[PDB]
From Swiss-Prot:
Glycans are attached at N83. One of its GO terms (cellular component) is endosome membrane. Mediates the endocytosis of glycoproteins by macrophages. Binds both sulfated and non-sulfated polysaccharide chains. (Microbial infection) Acts as a phagocytic receptor for bacteria, fungi and other pathogens. Its main location: membrane. It comes from Homo sapiens. The C-type lectin domains, also called carbohydrate-recognition domains or CRDs, 1-3 have at most very weak affinity for carbohydrates. C-type lectin domain 4 shows the highest affinity binding and has multispecificity for a variety of monosaccharides. At least 3 C-type lectin domains (4, 5, and 7) are required for high affinity binding and endocytosis of multivalent glycoconjugates. GO terms for biological process: cellular response to interleukin-4; cellular response to lipopolysaccharide; cellular response to type II interferon; receptor-mediated endocytosis. The gene is MRC1. This is Macrophage mannose receptor 1. Residues 142-190 form the Fibronectin type-II domain. It is found in: Endosome membrane; Cell membrane.
């Protein structure tokens, strides 16, 4: 996925590493290891066959591009994409070029024509689209540090993770260049026989969880580690899910990053996997009113309740794994208005407490509105008659099960859009009902015993 051939459209040829001193071109061959390259840092491109990096002797016109021992400090090994498909040495208008003066070697060249433009073979994208993706190690002795490609083991160089030196087939990488000297490694986030033993599958739900308690990563690094495993940071949307994760972490004490955060300045608490924030299990004193603490850790030594911390804290973490043809005219009863097969109405006449608003909607054949998409929310605010300074009941509430918000109409909660700072759900304030308020129609919990207007919904 992260190895690529380097393709020139005009010549219809791919780069081919012939030797450390001969980087040329050949008819493209997706199986040829000598045609395979990979980003091993932000700016370095490594030959997979040779475990050496493309570089130049100087940043000057018409010098050969060949292969050097990879060196992250060398300016002569740094490449960048200019315009779109122009490939050049960093910091100069000098380009990776093939075709001039009967020269079979790639040359660094002042020219910026089509012979200096390159794409990832099999795509329409430039090389920097499949840029460097740091690979965070699992278990091991390096606390989740990233693979250092290429790395040396038994005096041999590795361009990718390997099972060399092992009897169990597990794939690992050095987290420094010289593993022989430094002995720092971890296992790679890749598929291999036995790799699923890094996950715990809930038999009730078939959802899988990975508890990385030995790693020390920031919230954003931890998120990248889960993402590159086709996963995301833990989200917790059911009581059972919390109970299951409490048990899986019951012998741990240090904090574990989960996916909950307040990193969107204009909205409230949210899961990084876009799950609804509808279940709350905060530690006492959280979420705290401290502006820099926008990322949430599960504290396994305190019954796996949650606390918000500074995102740069290095912790373990937990992964979890034109109208449409159907938009036909919609029948609605008088005073109700259609959207996506349902009918809606705002009650402003007589403000009511939440439970009386609910009774009224139901006597009229509907219910307090549920809201399942941003488009449904946008219909309400932009067309239905909502004004920015409104505050109106919707159907979300945790009256039946404290800390577990549900829709009064019984439909699943699959979407939340909370105001900044919401849900606040402050101790002893009984904020068990929910309103839409403010110019964006975002939501807030609040006490249920206050007269307000409200929004009803029904099926057409
Ligand atoms: Ca509130």
């Amino acid at each position: 996925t992260r190895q690529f051939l380097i393709y020139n459209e005009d010549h219809k040829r791919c780069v081919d590493a012939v030797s450390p001193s001969a980087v040329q071109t050949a008819a493209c061959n997706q199986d040829a290891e000598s045609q395979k390259f990979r980003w091993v840092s932000e700016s370095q491109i490594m030959s997979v066959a040779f475990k050496l990096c493309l570089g130049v002797p100087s940043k000057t016109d018409w010098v050969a591009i060949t292969l050097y021992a990879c060196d992250s400090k060398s300016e002569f090994q740094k490449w960048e994409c200019k315009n779109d498909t122009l490939l050049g040495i960093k910091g100069e208008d000098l380009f990776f070029n093939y075709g001039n003066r009967q020269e079979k070697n790639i040359m660094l060249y002042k020219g910026s024509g089509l012979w200096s433009r390159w794409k990832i073979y099999g795509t329409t994208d430039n090389l920097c689209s499949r840029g460097y993706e740091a690979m965070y190690t699992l278990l091991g002795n390096a606390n989740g540090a990233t693979c250092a490609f290429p790395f040396k083991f038994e005096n041999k160089w590795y361009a990718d993770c390997t099972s060399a030196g092992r009897s169990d087939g597990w794939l690992w990488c050095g987290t420094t260049t010289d593993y022989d000297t430094d002995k720092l490694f971890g296992y790679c986030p890749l598929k291999f026989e036995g790799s699923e033993s890094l996950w715990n599958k809930d038999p009730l739900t078939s959802v899988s969880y990975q508890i990385n308690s030995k790693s020390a990563l920031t919230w954003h690094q931890a998120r990248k580690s889960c993402q590159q495993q086709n996963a995301e940071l833990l989200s917790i949307t059911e009581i059972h899910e919390q109970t299951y994760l409490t048990g899986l972490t019951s012998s741990l004490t240090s904090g574990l990053w989960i996916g909950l955060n307040s990193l969107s300045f204009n909205s409230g608490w949210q899961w990084s996997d876009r799950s609804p924030f509808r279940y709350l299990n905060w530690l006492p004193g959280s979420p705290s009113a401290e502006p820099g603490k926008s990322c949430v850790s599960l504290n396994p030594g305190k019954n796996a309740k949650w606390e918000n911390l500074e995102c740069v804290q290095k912790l373990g973490y937990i992964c979890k794994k034109i109208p449409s043809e159907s938009d036909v005219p919609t029948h609605c009863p008088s005073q109700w208005w259609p959207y996506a097969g349902h009918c809606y109405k705002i009650h402003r006449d007589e403000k009511k407490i939440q439970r009386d608003a609910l009774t009224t909607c139901r006597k009229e054949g509907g219910d307090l509105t549920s809201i399942h998409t941003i488009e449904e929310l946008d219909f309400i605010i932009s067309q239905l008659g909502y004004e920015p300074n409104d505050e109106l009941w919707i159907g979300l509430n945790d009256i039946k099960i404290q800390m577990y918000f549900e829709w009064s109409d019984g439909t699943p909660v699959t979407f939340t859009k909370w105001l900044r700072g919401e849900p606040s759900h402050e101790n002893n304030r009984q904020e068990d009902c929910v309103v839409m308020k403010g110019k964006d129609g975002y939501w807030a919990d609040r006490g249920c015993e206050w007269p307000l207007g409200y929004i009803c919904k029904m099926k057409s």
